[PDB]
Amino acid sequence: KDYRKKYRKYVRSRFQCIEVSLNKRYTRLRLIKESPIKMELLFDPDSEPVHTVVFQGAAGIGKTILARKMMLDWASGTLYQDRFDYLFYIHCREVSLVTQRSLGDLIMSCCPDPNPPIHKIVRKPSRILFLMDGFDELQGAFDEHIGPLCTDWQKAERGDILLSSLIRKKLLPEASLLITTRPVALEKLQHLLDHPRHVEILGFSEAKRKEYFFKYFSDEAQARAAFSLIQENEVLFTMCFIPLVCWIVCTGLKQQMESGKSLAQTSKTTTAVYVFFLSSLLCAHLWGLCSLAADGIWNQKILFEESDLRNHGLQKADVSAFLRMNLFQKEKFYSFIHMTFQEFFAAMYYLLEEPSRDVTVLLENYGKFEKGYLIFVVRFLFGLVNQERTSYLEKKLSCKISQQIRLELLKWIEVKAKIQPSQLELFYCLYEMQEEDFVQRAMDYFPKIEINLSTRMDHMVSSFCIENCHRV
């Protein structure tokens, strides 16, 4: 315990906030097993012991916020006090898959001091819980054929071999492991898991959506009026089960209240919501952000060093302006406030009017772990090429380029309609487009409707597309 106390102290300092006190704005999330699940009992059997737990969650659903909340509660003695002597937080986006490294090196880097008692930490592996946050955010490729597997926590291995050996339970077999990932990445992960317990993060319930708006707005009057807009807008109310969406919408309505204009948000698509957020912050640095984003996705870079920023014309003062308006975050290293914003600007890179800009090359890499699957680049590309879309940002886009891309997207649907993209995913893309002329032609390529629904947003998106089928 001599060093455990020093470590828990360091954990309560880093994970005190979400970077805003974590306990202040944290709002209970909904978890379901494989029924409601309780944190303390997460590693209890039914049977063999449960060493691996997998958290499936949508982008922005709150995987990282929940991992940080667990670090904090445990460090405070509220959670797993009797179970684990150590929790180590592994931020997958920082772990190179190429650099040779030892599990000891990895543990030591989670520690505050340079010379920790690593050999003591490892004496009781069953008392360790590894928290891998954002498996999908590993940069580069990653497949089940990796090998050979390592059984020595001191031996240095390529990052991919290291993580594979850890996930397969070859390294420290009886240590516990908690992985958070987006569902799409389970294609790769599933073949390594050993008797996993799968949990699903569902986000905010209707009552928790209200709670968030009230925790966000110090003034109750603002909270209740901001939430009234949501209640009135079927699409936003439904979409606000994603906590990230709650934060985007709340931050936007905040500006309107500072401007004094009567509150009103009429967004109908995710693209509309993300455009409503950026416009509220307002044009000179527009090209720079899209270049950086497109480069980051193509070359697998989430974290951007100052050399990359100056490389794309973003001077140090320009970056300080993004931090002020909460469009950038520093973590030396800079990154986008969320990966979805990096895909949004990457999509816009193909539509700006004066990395390759040939959309056909982009679509060839769709759904590949190596590039990050490109799920939201395509969704945002469908919504941005929408002719009906109008805004100060629409003028920066090229009508000619939008037309060429609109035509290629349609050829793309025709092939896929006759693996990823599923039919439901294409419904999300078509829902972003909205244009009935486009959607009606696209919907005719499908021989049959074949979908599986889980959420209200699934129902809404698929109802919109079914209604736009031809009727004899």
Ligand SMILES: Cc1ccc(C(F)(F)F)cc1Nc1nc(C(=O)NS(=O)(=O)N2CCCOCC2)co1
């Ligand atoms: C940020 C956001 C805004 C608005 C909406 C809403 F409008 F929809 F509410 C949803 C989200 N979040 C989100 N995350 C994923 C996500 O990560 N999906 S995925 O990659 O796992 N996938 C499912 C597995 C099969 O492949 C298809 C792709 C999809 O949507």
Ligand SMILES: Nc1ncnc2c1ncn2[C@@H]1O[C@H](COP(=O)(O)OP(=O)(O)O)[C@@H](O)[C@H]1O
């Ligand atoms: N439980 C929560 N309470 C309050 N805000 C949340 C919560 N979960 C997510 N958020 C919001 O989402 C953002 C980060 O989401 P994140 O945890 O990174 O989701 P993911 O890791 O699944 O993308 C934060 O800025 C925060 O405002």
Ligand SMILES: [Mg+2]
């Ligand atoms: Mg995350």
